[PDB]
Symmetry: D3
Subunit: 299 residues, 6 copies
């Protein structure tokens, strides 16, 4: 009368999980659902601390996704695999996993996919050809030429799929996994109309920092506020291209109160906290407040 199965209120709500949590959840559908109803915009967390223990703490807060950065995050291969597994298992399927991979590292990519990542963000995209190279490695034939791993499952033992006669989860992979090009250079912005129009993509992300450096704009240099006009134009071209092609934007929110504006701009997947900067600011701020409040005891 009190077992877990008899207490529905305790059950996990994981609308997009696969039959097995070692496989990617359906980010493809999650994005389509957020486009249809923006109140369902995915709210997630950026994960750059190379610690599966941290992934577990993040997963327990039940974010819509955990965005793991392998381009700049110091994750070893096995640890990346374990972090992806931990995100999906410790959130019991509620947290989809998106991984930003190094632009030319095939091993990081296959590791992320084999472990269950539902989305791949490609940095520094400037051509449609660069994106198609990822399509080839990310999807099984007939879509691409992704290599099938034998170690991810066990025939007749651990091979469940949401799809019919899909013992190898090829359908799961080709139907759930998403590709998200990241535009973060002058050349990328100049060719964004073509990239945004690719039938193969499921999202678009901008890299303000790298863009500003490449554009020769003083990053964090708004004298009297107001971003540089060149940046404004770049973001306008980028966002309009995504919107016209029905592509949701992926991005981060410097402050959570920016969310409504981002949604109005077309963002449907927003990282609302970043583990490294978030923890740093939380601790630094608490220390500052504490010391300040102790000054009254001087003398």
């Amino acid at each position: 009368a009190k077992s877990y199965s008899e207490q529905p209120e305790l059950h996990a709500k994981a609308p997009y999980r696969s039959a097995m949590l070692t496989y990617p959840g359906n980010l493809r559908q999650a994005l389509k659902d957020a486009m249809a109803d923006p109140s369902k915009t995915l709210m997630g967390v950026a994960h750059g601390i190379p610690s599966t223990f941290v992934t577990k703490v993040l997963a327990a807060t039940k974010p819509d996704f955990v965005w793991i950065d392998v381009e700049h995050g110091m994750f070893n291969r096995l640890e990346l695999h374990d972090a992806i597994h931990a995100a999906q298992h410790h959130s019991e399927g509620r947290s989809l996993v998106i991984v930003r991979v190094p632009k030319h590292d095939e091993v990081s990519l296959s590791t992320a996919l084999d472990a269950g990542a539902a989305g791949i963000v490609i940095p520094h995209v400037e051509t449609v050809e660069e994106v198609r190279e990822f399509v080839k490695e990310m999807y099984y034939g007939p879509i691409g030429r992704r290599s099938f791993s034998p170690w991810t499952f066990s025939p007749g033992i651990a091979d469940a799929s949401l799809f019919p006669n899909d013992p190898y989860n090829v359908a799961t992979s080709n139907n759930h996994v998403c590709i998200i090009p990241q535009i973060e250079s002058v050349k990328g912005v100049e060719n964004v109309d073509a990239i945004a129009a690719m039938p193969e993509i499921h999202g678009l992300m901008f890299g303000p920092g790298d863009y500003m450096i490449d554009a020769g704009l003083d990053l964090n240099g708004a004298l009297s506020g107001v971003p540089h006009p060149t940046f404004v134009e770049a973001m306008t071209k980028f966002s309009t291209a995504a919107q016209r092609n029905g592509v949701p934007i992926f991005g981060g929110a410097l402050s959570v109160d920016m969310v409504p504006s981002l949604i109005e701009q077309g963002y449907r997947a927003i990282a609302v906290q970043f583990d490294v900067w978030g923890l740093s600011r939380l601790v630094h701020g608490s220390l500052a407040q504490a010391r300040a409040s102790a000054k009254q005891f001087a003398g």
Copy 2:
């Protein structure tokens, strides 16, 4: 004209660091200084995530101390050693290290000391004898019988000390290192007057959670607020014992605005943030706010 040495404003302020950051900073003096001037109460951070990368992020915020929990933190031996080194090196000596060790684990204790911990918190202390067993293992003769490690330094190469003719840093260790008993049981509270009076101790900490469980008090059970009277009496006996013997209290601040009251109560070392709970609450709260702000787009 612009090297680091020529830019004093960039130099680290590490009032208590030892000659080498592989050795403990002077927590003994830091505590005495905070007692003399409570505006100098040490503000630190509790560290339970077993990741040296996290220690580095915490150390960069320059807390007065990093409190590493080995009683319940999943740190392996080498990783504990590396975390202690990282706390002191990445804060360039500004962050002293305090380690709460498992009550009967000699290896955790020697590892913490050999790596440079300046303070040891002993859990579940109930007798003066239990504390004296730690004195024996924590200090070199004539104070105790701590074993001298040969691998922590290199004779004539890396053996600097703040003390005269102290090539083995025996003086550094015996003069800088502190012992902090933690009172967290009914029997501990009943014998706190004796424990607080020990000439060997340098601080006292209370464990509210374990105490409440041991006392049969409903942890987190304040119907209309107001803590249980049995707990109030326990804290009064504990704090009065510490105060009368000139022993500073070590503790945590549930909310940073509690700091002034804690200082008034005799706390001179306060953990103002906890990595696990802090990160969890930060992310969970941001997610909640984000989703709430997206509801306006429903339909």
Copy 3:
């Protein structure tokens, strides 16, 4: 019409899982249910390979339990914690975790419990006092004095329990966790009547190997088969003591066809495969058969 939630046949059957998989499943009830209906005798796997990847492979086969050996298994602290989490999460709660700990290692014990182990096997038990020392460390007051860890959960975020007003999962821990003394010495057998009668225990295990060595019996020395009479008497005294006190026996099955006999003897938790020996024999046997079948091509 095809999401996971809409495909009940794919849902995990985890009769004893807790509200959160970071907490122990109800082994206490599982054992009582197996005693009531022996067809429900728990069939599990012994895990001595210190690799969480292996734990994941074992968990995917959905054993009733994964028995992790820390007395002789080379698991580091963090890796033990991760293996316990992996067993429960990758089996989605179907696999309870039992850990045999080193007889005097408090850190191994607290690590196993804090990570979610539902059963603790104590090696070389010879006195009721030795068992009561484990009761003190394994259960929270009023039963024992186990220390409460703050890092295992997150207040108001990740603290679900199957029990009412149990935000700290103290009820979960004290109601789900089991103690299993292991009898494996001459003195242990001589005092088994007293050990078996302890109200605090939930199972009993025998250690044939250590017993035989201690008894001076030629381990693996059955000339014409037929175990030594001294061993037979020892097992009879052991099994009769367990049976008369209503204590289920925990043990291993050298060959799976021994299961019926073991159940008839009172075993209600049986390890039917061992990862190290199982993998070794599987590979060695396949190699032998392969080479033998190739001999026909000689010349």
Copy 4:
């Protein structure tokens, strides 16, 4: 009269080991010997579990080779190095090491070679040019341009070689190491005659799974058994090409009783067990049998 040296029956039979076990054994000769006498066909084990402890267990069963999969196995760099060392040292040279590397990862390749791998399997080979890129990186001049590592040996201390005046083991490497292209795509099969004819190769392997996906064939879709004709033709073209050029085939045996047929088909290196699937099936099968045998106790 009883030391190891005085007990020849206990000595290791390692026909192809190098002077030092940190260097590759002579797989080149082992393959030639198996071609001359098929009863000597190499029987090995596939290793996909990223654990050196597992490598040690596998090595102790004395397989003719351990096939480590780095294309899909989650081995970190140092762990790959350690696994290769463990395979050769724990089998005392009896187990040669073959590594399937990611197709474009130079670091995985140099790590595998520097650690002592005697064979490299190249996945998804479709052109002779792709194979020649591996020849360049796998062999020292004059054969290729492989970079010489200084850290693998110690001049005048640990630099033994089976070859004369070969202090750097350049001869060992160029004479012992083998290249094995893996054909697993429609284009690969279409160009197999050319690949099989390369004077540089020492073996050929087929990838049925990837081939079937690429060919649009229902993997595991034999309605009434009988593989797809397109697959049969592909295997016939592949095997005939290998046979006509005197190239031994490398492959796996779904069941050990397939060995004779595989040898008749030209296989001279067969993986007769796979650690991940083998352990999974062993445990799952034992659990099933155990539970089934317990049903008689229901009620």
Copy 5:
């Protein structure tokens, strides 16, 4: 009167350290200073043992630089990051870090730079184009297109720089970091005049071993001493090219007494000890001497 700050003699002399030790020290200036005054030639140590503990021991000896070999050293990604941090922090900024990376591995390169490496050595350089590919990845725009990592610092908390209005340390990176092509092939030597003349480079290194193999010269084959004339000519062409273009040479000293000659030849960064070979020879030599001295006790 005796704190660290009051004991200047104990302070670290780190002429080239950055504002934060997580950022590269100024190797660019160190090299220019050594060119101006060769008595300041950088004396460092080569590090091939994949252990951060070893890095710490090496850093404590205060070398002018620690040269980490990732081309052939078995460093995992996170461990490489930690070794670079340890070299700079445990030497308190006195030891600059130079990393030789695999020629085509972008992740090794970004990891080395993000962790604080001040110099990158590129192996097997044969064309100016190969070097310019590294310039693109090593420096931020306008010099290159290096991607900016968000996880290396914390805005407003840990972002100090020696340069004005340089919150992102872009100036630090572009002004401190050096590129050192390594010439170690016949084609490399044939094109050394062009490589040496590149305005983008800051040093040149020769690879005698790889060169000799590529040139078909008997490495370690000086019958009556005297290196092969082809090698002499190669080194002459190499050194003259470096000297005429004002490029300092980077190299190793087989024996420390070679230093004066190397400086006369234009070397300004010399690795005077190698951890693997150094430790090996030290131990092997001590063992030999010890056993030899014990022979007098025979009988």
Copy 6:
């Protein structure tokens, strides 16, 4: 005509290795042989760097033993196990392993033994009772009550022994393993006659550093050389006790030229190099010499 088996000069000389290198070599006999012929005094290396890669480098120099310090060396459990395996396997049985364990850590002890350590050094021994507690845990019945591990071998597959009908290697363990008390306190010296007379011990070691601290003697305080008389007396009492009871002394040689004198004093196992201090001094010395030789180029 050139295989390894056909080149006896390349074969390993391992007089004391067991049938399997996962088991302890015969240190018991090695010590007896050194006592009979002191020219055979064991020359080994002390290993305090927690890196199995380092163990491999040390093992390749073929020391008579590798002395691993777990009392003060930061070895994790699995890493200790791997280091012990590496020492014996990479020296192909020539290097026996001695481990100094923490005085009260049962897990360190069982790990060291289960991995193959042939000798255990017990620190801070002061009573015969302390030594007998180790005898109980180190040897199987009838000698002690050491627990038998099932994971160290594989029945019928990997269970070879030098002894007859010893499938569990109980004879190997009880006949090869040695106990070495370490005397390093005033009380230890005062009771050395009794400790030295124990029939159970196989060696004796002194701890000069800890002794001097405990005795209140200025460690490294020989004004005009000449050790303190109290120390001289202590060493005389210690050495005479060992000699009269036929117990060989275990110790270290500050400089290799001390070996003859140590042998004359009764030492039969001498650590002639220490990895941490050895590497530190080698590098520091090379740096000093290099910089000194560069001074001539100043100006």
